[PDB]
Amino acid sequence: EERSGVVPCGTPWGQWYQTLEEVFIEVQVPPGTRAQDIQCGLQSRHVALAVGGREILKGKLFDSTIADEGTWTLEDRKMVRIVLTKTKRDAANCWTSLLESEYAADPWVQDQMQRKLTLERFQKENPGFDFS
Amino acid sequence: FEERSGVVPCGTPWGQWYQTLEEVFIEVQVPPGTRAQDIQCGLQSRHVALAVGGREILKGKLFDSTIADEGTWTLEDRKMVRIVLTKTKRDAANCWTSLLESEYAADPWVQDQMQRKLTLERFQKENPGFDFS
Numbered sequence A: 001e002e003r004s005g006v007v008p009c010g011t012p013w014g015q016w017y018q019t020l021e022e023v024f025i026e027v028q029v030p031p032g033t034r035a036q037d038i039q040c041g042l043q044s045r046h047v048a049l050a051v052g053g054r055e056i057l058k059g060k061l062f063d064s065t066i067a068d069e070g071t072w073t074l075e076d077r078k079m080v081r082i083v084l085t086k087t088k089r090d091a092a093n094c095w096t097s098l099l100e101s102e103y104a105a106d107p108w109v110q111d112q113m114q115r116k117l118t119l120e121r122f123q124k125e126n127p128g129f130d131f132s
Numbered sequence B: 001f002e003e004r005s006g007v008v009p010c011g012t013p014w015g016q017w018y019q020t021l022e023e024v025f026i027e028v029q030v031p032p033g034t035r036a037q038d039i040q041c042g043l044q045s046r047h048v049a050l051a052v053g054g055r056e057i058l059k060g061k062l063f064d065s066t067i068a069d070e071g072t073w074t075l076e077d078r079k080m081v082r083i084v085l086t087k088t089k090r091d092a093a094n095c096w097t098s099l100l101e102s103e104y105a106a107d108p109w110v111q112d113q114m115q116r117k118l119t120l121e122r123f124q125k126e127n128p129g130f131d132f133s
Helices: A106-127 B108-126
Strands: A009-011 A014-018 A022-028 A038-042 A046-052 A054-060 A071-075 A079-085 A097-099 A103-106 B016-020 B022-030 B039-043 B047-052 B055-061 B071-076 B080-086 B098-100 B103-105
Touching: A009 B098, A009 B103, A022 A046, A022 A054, A038 A071, A046 B080, A054 B080, A079 B039, A079 B047, A097 B016, A103 A106, A106 B108, B022 B047, B022 B055, B039 B071
Parallel strands: none
Antiparallel strands: A009 A014, A014 A022, A022 B080, A038 A046, A046 A054, A071 B080, A079 B022, A079 B071, A097 A103, B016 B022, B039 B047, B047 B055, B098 B103
16 A cells, blocks of 8 residues: 555566665565575675575665665565456556546556556557667 | 566555556455465456455456456465665655666666656655645
8 A cells, every 4th residue: 555656677586666765675485485594684785685595686786775774574475366358458548446436546646557558558559669 | 577667556455456558457465375275256347356265355346347258366476575775865866777786777667657756755745735636
């Protein structure tokens, strides 16, 4: 719910995203991973994570962080993922809520979702252009 | 989640949903001991229903119509390590363009989405009296 409108960057092991104040790194691990199987060092400008001895992520951070405040936690995140195919699939078929009268996006999240769909359509209609 | 770049979620009490031009995605957190056998899920053109271990989690009329025979549900193990870092510099102008100095960069559009959310977060913080819904 604090989740609404957060923009992730996908990576091979998960994703990261940010807020004005923090940077979030979500790393998928095997389902039998235990807290005891994690080695994670968080320094002002560097991070390192190894799971069951296998290095997953290690390097120099894009910018500096306050080392003492860094946290890591192992979370159980089992989920049912449902994927539906829209009958109508134009950028103007941007759903503003999941159900008719529930799970509405606030106006800003609606704007973000519309923008992404406009961009998807633009990229589809202009396959020749490079967007990176 | 590399197709996940720039997908914009709406959080809910049980998880989140999001969309693309063609599909709608519903991610529902379930207890870690949940098994496929514990799931009852009906996906109709304009209605959905999900119950886990006999407990109804989601049920209602969809915002718009979907192609019923193409709807899918899958149970996924999603254990994760979540790391939270505190930026030394916390202005909307300290929008990170990659996670590491030379790796995990956002493409230009995702960078723009990220910057827009930070500008907005900042706008909301500097104007607490305005209602943003």
